[PDB]
Amino acid sequence: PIETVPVKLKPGMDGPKVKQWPLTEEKIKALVEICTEMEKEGKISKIGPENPYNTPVFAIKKKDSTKWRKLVDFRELNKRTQDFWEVQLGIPHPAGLKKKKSVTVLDVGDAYFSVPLDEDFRKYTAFTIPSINNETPGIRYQYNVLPQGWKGSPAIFQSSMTKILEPFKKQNPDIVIYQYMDDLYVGSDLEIGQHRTKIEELRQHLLRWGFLWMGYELHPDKWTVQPIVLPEKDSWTVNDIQKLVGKLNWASQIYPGIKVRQLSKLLRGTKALTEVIPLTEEAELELAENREILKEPVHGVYYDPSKDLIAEIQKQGQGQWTYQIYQEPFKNLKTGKYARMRGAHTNDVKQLTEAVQKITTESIVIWGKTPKFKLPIQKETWETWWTEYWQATWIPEWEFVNTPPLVKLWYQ
Amino acid sequence: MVPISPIETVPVKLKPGMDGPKVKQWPLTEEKIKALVEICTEMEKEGKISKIGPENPYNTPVFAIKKKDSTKWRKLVDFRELNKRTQDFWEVQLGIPHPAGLKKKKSVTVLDVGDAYFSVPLDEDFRKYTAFTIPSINNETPGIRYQYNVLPQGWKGSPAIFQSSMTKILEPFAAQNPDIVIYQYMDDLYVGSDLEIGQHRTKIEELRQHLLRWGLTTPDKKHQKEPPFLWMGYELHPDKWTVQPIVLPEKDSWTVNDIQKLVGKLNWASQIYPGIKVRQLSKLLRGTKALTEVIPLTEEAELELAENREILKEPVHGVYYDPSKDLIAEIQKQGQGQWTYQIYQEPFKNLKTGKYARMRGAHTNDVKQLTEAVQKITTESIVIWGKTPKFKLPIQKETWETWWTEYWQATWIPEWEFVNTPPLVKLWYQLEKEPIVGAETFYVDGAANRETKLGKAGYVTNKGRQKVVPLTNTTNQKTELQAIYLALQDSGLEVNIVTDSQYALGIIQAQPDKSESELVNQIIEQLIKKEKVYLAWVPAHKGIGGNEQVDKLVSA
Numbered sequence A: 001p002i003e004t005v006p007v008k009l010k011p012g013m014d015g016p017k018v019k020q021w022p023l024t025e026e027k028i029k030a031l032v033e034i035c036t037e038m039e040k041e042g043k044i045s046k047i048g049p050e051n052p053y054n055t056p057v058f059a060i061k062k063k064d065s066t067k068w069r070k071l072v073d074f075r076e077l078n079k080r081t082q083d084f085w086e087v088q089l090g091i092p093h094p095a096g097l098k099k100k101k102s103v104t105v106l107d108v109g110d111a112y113f114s115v116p117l118d119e120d121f122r123k124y125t126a127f128t129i130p131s132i133n134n135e136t137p138g139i140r141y142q143y144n145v146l147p148q149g150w151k152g153s154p155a156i157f158q159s160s161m162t163k164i165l166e167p168f169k170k171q172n173p174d175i176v177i178y179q180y181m182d183d184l185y186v187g188s189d190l191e192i193g194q195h196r197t198k199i200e201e202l203r204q205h206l207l208r209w210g211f212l213w214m215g216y217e218l219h220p221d222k223w224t225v226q227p228i229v230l231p232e233k234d235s236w237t238v239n240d241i242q243k244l245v246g247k248l249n250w251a252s253q254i255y256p257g258i259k260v261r262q263l264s265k266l267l268r269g270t271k272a273l274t275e276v277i278p279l280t281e282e283a284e285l286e287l288a289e290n291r292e293i294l295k296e297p298v299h300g301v302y303y304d305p306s307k308d309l310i311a312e313i314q315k316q317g318q319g320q321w322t323y324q325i326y327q328e329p330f331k332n333l334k335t336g337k338y339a340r341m342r343g344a345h346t347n348d349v350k351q352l353t354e355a356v357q358k359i360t361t362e363s364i365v366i367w368g369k370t371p372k373f374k375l376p377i378q379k380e381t382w383e384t385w386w387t388e389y390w391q392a393t394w395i396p397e398w399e400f401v402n403t404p405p406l407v408k409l410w411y412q
Numbered sequence B: 001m002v003p004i005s006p007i008e009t010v011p012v013k014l015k016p017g018m019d020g021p022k023v024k025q026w027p028l029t030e031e032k033i034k035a036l037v038e039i040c041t042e043m044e045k046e047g048k049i050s051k052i053g054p055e056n057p058y059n060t061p062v063f064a065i066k067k068k069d070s071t072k073w074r075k076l077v078d079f080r081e082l083n084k085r086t087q088d089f090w091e092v093q094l095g096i097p098h099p100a101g102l103k104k105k106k107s108v109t110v111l112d113v114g115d116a117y118f119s120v121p122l123d124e125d126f127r128k129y130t131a132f133t134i135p136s137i138n139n140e141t142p143g144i145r146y147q148y149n150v151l152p153q154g155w156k157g158s159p160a161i162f163q164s165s166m167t168k169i170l171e172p173f174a175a176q177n178p179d180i181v182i183y184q185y186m187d188d189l190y191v192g193s194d195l196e197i198g199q200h201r202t203k204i205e206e207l208r209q210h211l212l213r214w215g216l217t218t219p220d221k222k223h224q225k226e227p228p229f230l231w232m233g234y235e236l237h238p239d240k241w242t243v244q245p246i247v248l249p250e251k252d253s254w255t256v257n258d259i260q261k262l263v264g265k266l267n268w269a270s271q272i273y274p275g276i277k278v279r280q281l282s283k284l285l286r287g288t289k290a291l292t293e294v295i296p297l298t299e300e301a302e303l304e305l306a307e308n309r310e311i312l313k314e315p316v317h318g319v320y321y322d323p324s325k326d327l328i329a330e331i332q333k334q335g336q337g338q339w340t341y342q343i344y345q346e347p348f349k350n351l352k353t354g355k356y357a358r359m360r361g362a363h364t365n366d367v368k369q370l371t372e373a374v375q376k377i378t379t380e381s382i383v384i385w386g387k388t389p390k391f392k393l394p395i396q397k398e399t400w401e402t403w404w405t406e407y408w409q410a411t412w413i414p415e416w417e418f419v420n421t422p423p424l425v426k427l428w429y430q431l432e433k434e435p436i437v438g439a440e441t442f443y444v445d446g447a448a449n450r451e452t453k454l455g456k457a458g459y460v461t462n463k464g465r466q467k468v469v470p471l472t473n474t475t476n477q478k479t480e481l482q483a484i485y486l487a488l489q490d491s492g493l494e495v496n497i498v499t500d501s502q503y504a505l506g507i508i509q510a511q512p513d514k515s516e517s518e519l520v521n522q523i524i525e526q527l528i529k530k531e532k533v534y535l536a537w538v539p540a541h542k543g544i545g546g547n548e549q550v551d552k553l554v555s556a
């Protein structure tokens, strides 16, 4: 691939100028070794002071791998890089991927380093390996080839990839293959033994066209909007009925026809919260009619590819996290719940970071893009710690929730 | 002639769309012109500048100034205009090392590189932009026109390009001599090591040998400064460091300017002098932009100052960093949102100190502030030492566990141990998860007229207890909290409270222990006195008994 693809920023936009955040010594050392080798292989070059741009860099360890890996935070460069239609008017996202019984995630970002990056654009990929305590200037580099995590890399490489895959796709018409950034998502409806065979029979095919040996296995079988459920009880206290009317009043914003009049009627007076209240027939029927309403899907829910996906997360305690993905309030496109996050029964922030990564993966599989997160955490705590538990090659956007939402209860 | 290597040129451009400068040269006196001609003839002989013709259309004004004992005219080329038009550079100097991160060095040499500076050539395609003109005597001949061949002093790119050029020249020497450290500041170059003065002097000669490959001569700095090095506001001693003398002035009149400088010194001093505090002195500046406004000191600002003078009465010093020892960070609560800390490796030998002040906000609590202080110190320690310290915190292990298991946000603090140093951070109240059997149930409500500001707050209970209080100059939100306050005041040690106020729930669920609202503070004081409080929420105007009753009582 001698010919470079002309790339430009968007009109009236300079390159990124993002501060490098401080790194521990062990991550600095890991990055020095990695970048020394990349430089010997020609993937990056030392740059001079006439280049004022910068994108942050850090070091991670992929899911269950002891080898340090370099991760560049290209979020700013990606939003400044021209919108891309490298080959066609767009890649219609495969609605069939989310329906497949199993989906395996392959890191193919190494393939990018075989394509040269347009020489006029290289300066915008500048990054700095920082020094400890400013005791030496940072090491300054730019990319000479398509970098991992950049928007343009899958776009510029798409002509090459579609050809590397066509033989495999030609024989397996029922296997769905989707690429998002540095990742290939390979899905099928067959028992894993053949699946891991096909998967291993895909990377080998890839190895003969020029890898990693890592995979991530999913089952979009169980992905929908979780029903709102109401308690089933033989004796209701005042407190129980108050919590029920509250939940039903919240649900009435999502569902038409929810009624609470007959249930509210039970609370006629000024009763002790622990007092048992017998349900009337009218109240039981109303509750029954509410249960029915809540069995059907929400009215007029549709994905609009022009709008952002928004992901909200609630800490429920004891290792449990609930989340909703939507574009418009009360029109959830997906809800879910996580329990017992792996490797952090005593660390909230690690659990939140893994939940953010799982929700992002689900979002890529369903819609082919990442949501904007609303995180139940103070900014300074999140920004101090999340890079410590990040294991993905992409990074989504996020904002912080500082006021406790009343609705955490309703997803309980 | 011994061939020398050229210093690699940095290519430079003007900002997109901009041309070079075209500033008119001012008239100069005959005396100044004479001086400038002499100065420039000498710079021209040294290769720093070259004569050019009148084809070049750019120009930057030049001036002649002097010192008062110094018996000469000085030359000044004002590159303000050219700097506005020059591309930005990677400014590789902004941050400096913190002394507490430095490691002890037995021997340190200084080398003057002021002359190596002029060996750094300016990009040839950029020189034209540096043209200037010496006006002629009596303006009767063409002005003498020159341009720079070297990095001009005063030009936007000279510091970054000079430092980058030296770094690249020095890199092979530093890489192959890992038993020395090399650091550059202005025209000075500092070389430290733990070698005997003999091998150390030998590395210096080797470094001199190395720099000669680029024709760079480097003698020792004039009037070798005995320790400590005065540098960036510090005193770098061979085995200790501190800030330069902190002297608080004595005054009976303090203006808005005085109090700003006092905080500056105090903030600077707080990196080694433990327990410095600057709230009460900062509070006297909340919002002003005029600087002689004599602001009297509160009895609390005076106390704070006097407390600082005591801390500053004697000099204190930090130690340098020992990589083979643990790194320990200890925090104390000081009051009024203020926090202090010490970072050390051996007890009583601080590497450095610091402070943290609560963020601006309507409500807050001590555990959130402590958490924030921990993240600040974590980030500072990664900068300075490349690692997180072990924390010693004035909060019990059980208190922290209760906090983070129950708090609605995710939160984390890294490896830490309890240090029993009062005052201790604690949870002041904890709400119940379930309604309390046998406890009276208060249904509270409040309401206010938007126009008249008249309102009512009150409660009704399952025992028939009732209260409605009329209020003036109030709001819906304030009557809603006032109703909760009355229920707390009038109930026993255990109480169930039912509100429809999402506003009040949002406040209390945030678990504040102090507020800028006196009413919230009064509610906090009540909660602290209770044994058990269950707070339940219901939606307004849905016929919820008790809520319906009190709602009508307070709504006119």
Ligand SMILES: Cc1cc(/C=C/C#N)cc(C)c1Oc1nc(NC2CCN(Cc3ccc(S(N)(=O)=O)cc3)CC2)nc2ccsc12
Pocket (backbone or CB within 6 Å): A135, A136, B097, B102, B103, B104, B105, B106, B107, B108, B109, B181, B182, B183, B185, B190, B191, B192, B227, B228, B229, B230, B231, B236, B237, B238, B239, B320
């Ligand atoms: C080497 C150096 C010098 C300075 C001075 C500026 C001024 N004006 C600044 C920095 C950042 C330097 O850079 C590094 N300095 C250190 N450590 C220091 C070395 C100096 N001592 C003080 C001292 C020691 C011995 C003598 S003595 N016995 O020769 O009289 C005199 C003074 C404190 C620790 N470590 C590193 C690591 C990477 S860079 C760097």
Ligand SMILES: [Mg+2]
Pocket (backbone or CB within 6 Å): B445, B446, B447, B500, B540, B551
């Ligand atoms: Mg009301």
